[PDB]
Amino acid sequence: FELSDVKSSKSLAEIYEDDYTLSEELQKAHSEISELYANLVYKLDVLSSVHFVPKPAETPTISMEDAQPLYMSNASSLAPQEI
Amino acid sequence: KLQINRVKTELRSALKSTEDDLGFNVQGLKFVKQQWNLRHN
């Protein structure tokens, strides 16, 4: 762990608001990591593929696809041993 | 054949009695859970 030795831009209130309100920046790296590998794998897959490889692809959002059928209930998905 | 017939009929009644017992309970217990859900929902 490295301690900053320069003046903090955020003022004594601001750290209190930050405290009032695993890491948001850490998962931003995760998401951007996943983006590149999709890009890297695609291009390498394109160059090494015999056959055509397509390019990989607020407001309430609709779930186009569901892991389980609509009529199926979550409770019915659990074994008696699990319950 | 008469031996087979007697075995069949009595065997049916025993199995049917148990299934009726199981069928009743699952419905009644389901009802109890459903009523409690309304009270606490």
Binding site: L78, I83 | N5, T18, D21, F24, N25, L29, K33, W36
Partner: protein, 79 residues
């Protein structure tokens, strides 16, 4: 409460559920079904009784279906 903890335990075992199914039946036929609900914690016990009861109900019914062999032996015997 104590009786129906035992029935839950007995229901889990396929060799002893039949005793549990008859005991729980007698309870429903001889008690106020409003009343059993408010008793604290009984939903949770009742929650565990359903899945095993359904498994047993799925069973036996299969036994009844594949018990009709006795008819097929009889009708073939009749020919």
């Amino acid at each position: 409460i104590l009786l129906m903890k035992r029935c839950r335990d007995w229901n889990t075992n396929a060799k002893t559920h039949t005793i549990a199914q008859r005991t729980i039946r007698c309870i429903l036929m001889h008690h106020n079904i409003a009343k059993l609900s408010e008793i604290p914690g009984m939903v949770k016990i009742v929650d565990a009784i359903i899945p095993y009861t359904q498994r047993h109900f799925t069973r036996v019914d299969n036994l009844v279906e594949q018990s009709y062999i006795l008819d097929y032996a009889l009708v073939e015997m009749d020919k």
